[model samples]
Target: LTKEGLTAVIVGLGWDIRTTTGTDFDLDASALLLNSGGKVASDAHFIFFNNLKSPDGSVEHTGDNITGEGEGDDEQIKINLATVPADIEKIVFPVSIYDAENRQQSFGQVRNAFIRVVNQAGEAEIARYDLSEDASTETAMVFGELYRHGAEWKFRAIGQGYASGLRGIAQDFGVNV
Candidate 1:
């Protein structure tokens, strides 16, 4: 609505239980602002519930949702496309089951987990990727990634699995701990 350029956008993450269960899934959504080397420029580039936004004010996580009880967009990260620093090459979106290692929980217990990109202004979805894979052995998954293809932004569905929980993801993306 502002102009021809898509300056701002929203990446939404949501999920639900497939059957009756005695446990609750504490899922979290995170964004890692990667540089040309495919690593976060700095620890500050790791945006999550605690670190809400990036240093440049380009990306911000819209709070946290521990219990996946409700509907659409349980956790969201709103990004200012035009304001993102040029040095930041790509943004990796990963969701993890909190304390999965301790609680023995995994995405296999959940169903219909998906992520979508929305045009913030128009409030319409531009793309979506379903991560409905019942990964019983995996506690973390990379749902998607948003990157710049020359001038415009692009989205890719990266349904990659991780068994080391969020710590593994953070380490791979250059997070200290």
Candidate 2:
């Protein structure tokens, strides 16, 4: 990670939002990290934390995408690790959804959602984020930056099947800092 620049790209996984959640369109969302390199572990994981929640008790990314989409219908998300810490070892990205008084559905339905990190040269797998024993819940999704020594960038996804009302990352990805 460097100190001069930073950037992120988000992808929208296509999904239907007509009745399951009552969302008419895809929800925008965002992803953020503590900006650190991670340790080298054979079983490291990553999770995305969104600030907002869905009406059906699903999690939201930083923007407004829903949490538990079953298909790849929304946009894709990218991250430039050039702005994070140099010696940083590991990072935990969690997907937090908006839970209103009436929202209370399980968010463990989304499948194949994950984050992947490549080396600075963009030629290797530094880390991977997926549904592991450690990163199964919304709180324990953390992956390690093994080859990220002096690395410059990384990438990941907040994927789902729902295509409307707070799905991926944006204000829906976070609550505070």
Candidate 3:
């Protein structure tokens, strides 16, 4: 949390990635609003390229960037703490290749992979995590998470990777298949 009440703040969760070569770096950003039991508040709480917004309107994905092109935030997820469900204790962001196995791509083939959280109202950066390590065999990453503590929220960097890609991450988050 920044200043004032945590509920009053709106955070902008953003990510950027550039491949060393080739254009099919198709990385995707997704968020899961989890309850205290470590499950989604609802199926609609999973926001990603397919489901752009959460049911309560607390989390939203700006749009899916087919190509990890240009610079700065190829994908963004907007979150409104005030509107999030009270049962929600955490929100996690995960990044994965569109078709890692078929595309023959991994984070090792990329550079400058980062995730940043900012105060959307003031455009002030709250925290940022750089996935600087070379992931030769990994095809997905759980970039970071925002969790509630008492009345405030905290951001934690969790640059862990997976070999099974998005399906793995989804299963871990209680998503069927």
Candidate 4:
């Protein structure tokens, strides 16, 4: 935090579509504000479409992007590092397809899907992780996570895929889906 002088950051999610289906992909970016128990302290801690901001107003989801994945970042989440609560140990970033089963879609139909963390002040990239996926069954993905390293904030690229969709991630994080 001191070295980078980063008081705030932006988590960006972007991808390219490979399928020619008439229906566009509705990929969403959500952040989980968790405590040491590895679960959200409250329902408001799960920042998603309906709930875009955290209880403390430290984290905010830009909004849902249900458009072409052909351009730059489709979704962005802003995190005020300095104002983030002390009880929060980590923030998880996940991207999930809205209706994979109904749309007959998966990450396998996506290309150049990536997640990046950037300094909000200057928009300088801090960490970028381009996920690699070959599975035709993955409907949701964990791009990366930001956690505390002592008093300093750190980022870890997860790039994990899941076939169980967004509900799986919610359940794993101890949130009711």
Candidate 5:
């Protein structure tokens, strides 16, 4: 059997969506190796999670910057996915979209969403989120930010697996549909 060769990547996922005229996520950035991991998983780790909500009780996808402004405005999050272990199967990303009436109106709103990772070879998408009125409720997905934080140094959350819904409404914003 052939052995799996070592891998590295750099992800640059950007979100761009426009609803009214001025509203969206905008925060561009990059990444740097915080710590180097070995063949063992315990050496490296990467985790990302964000929440976006509208002021008028509307739940949208704020493409990028967790704290930005304007419509179509983008927010980018960067991180090195190299520290992933070898014996791993896939990586996971867990994201949550809170509500405006949930006492935390600072979460903002979202339009289009995307999370990607770049490396020496290139970049790969691990997760993407699409929201609508029928599914505009604060919820969480296991693969949204679920990574092997401690073991074999492998990256799992990639372009496949269950890119499906989070089962059901986690906590209906407690409002009329």
Candidate 6:
């Protein structure tokens, strides 16, 4: 979708990482703006807990949630299509567990993991993706992606999991590990 009538497109990442045992199930939301070659446009375009906004101001991450305790969107990302660089053909969203190895946690232990895109102007959901499978050995997931299909934008449900955590995804996208 174009940013013609919309103020922005909000990409939401939410999950119930709560556990009965009180183990901190810290889940983080992140995004990577990539060029045609699938490589990041730049390190500044990487939006995560540490880096909350893109260099061009097209993307902004709400905040970091150490514990997924509450309801609704635990993490939200705002993207202005008009501000996105033309060279940035794709944006990938990923959710990762904070120190999953040390904490002995994975998506298998989490619940209600979901990602959705909404039109901020209309306040309507454009698309939604729910991760319903059990990931016993995985600690990271590429939840979805928003890409440019010619002049229009498209959202794809990736739902790919990785056992290597956040560093693995960073390395895959040519970010410093």
lDDT score, candidate 3 = 0.74
What's the distance in Å from true for residue 58, model 2?
A: 27
Q: Write the per-residue lDDT of candidate 3 for residues 98-128, one digit (tens) a residue.
A: 8978888776566676567776667777766
Stretches of candidate 5 exceeding 4 Å from the true structure: 1-6, 10-13, 16-18, 21-64, 67-91, 98-109, 117-120, 124-138, 144-177
Estimate the TM-score for candidate 1. 0.86
Judge candidate 1 against the unseen true structure and give its global Cα lDDT, from 0 to 1.
0.83
lDDT of 6 by residue, 1-177 (tens): 854334478988778868687677788889999999999888877799989999888999999988776898899999998778899998999888899889888766778866688988689998776653544457888878888987777778787888788888988998875
- Report the Cα lDDT for residue 75, model 2: 33
Candidate closer to the true structure by TM-score (higher is better), 2 or 3: 3
Which whole-number lDDT from 0 to 100 does residue 121 have in model 5? 42
**Judged by lDDT against the true structure, how good is candidate 2?**
0.33
What lDDT does the true structure give each of the candidates?
0.83, 0.33, 0.74, 0.81, 0.32, 0.82
The better-scoring model by lDDT among 4 and 6 is: 6
Between prediction 3 and prediction 6, the one with superior TM-score is: 6
Question: Better model by lDDT, 2 or 5?
Answer: 2
Candidate 1 stretches with Cα past 4 Å from truth are: 1-6, 17-21, 134-137
* Candidate 4 local lDDT, 1-177, one digit each (tens): 555436789998787754675677777889999999899878789999889999999999888888645588888999998999999989999888888789887765767766689987888898876543543457788777888988788778787887788878877898877
- Number of clashes in every candidate structure? 0, 80, 0, 0, 43, 0
- Of 4 and 5, the candidate ranking higher by TM-score: 4
Q: Candidate 2 versus the native: TM-score? A: 0.36
| 1 Cα displacement, candidate 1 (Å) | 14
Q: In TM-score terms, which candidate is top?
A: 6
**Pairing residues by index, what is the TM-score of model 6?**
0.88
Model 4 poorest 10 in a row by lDDT: 129-138
lDDT of 2 by residue, 31-77 (tens): 33332322211111122333232222211333335543445434333
Better structure of 3 and 6 per lDDT: 6
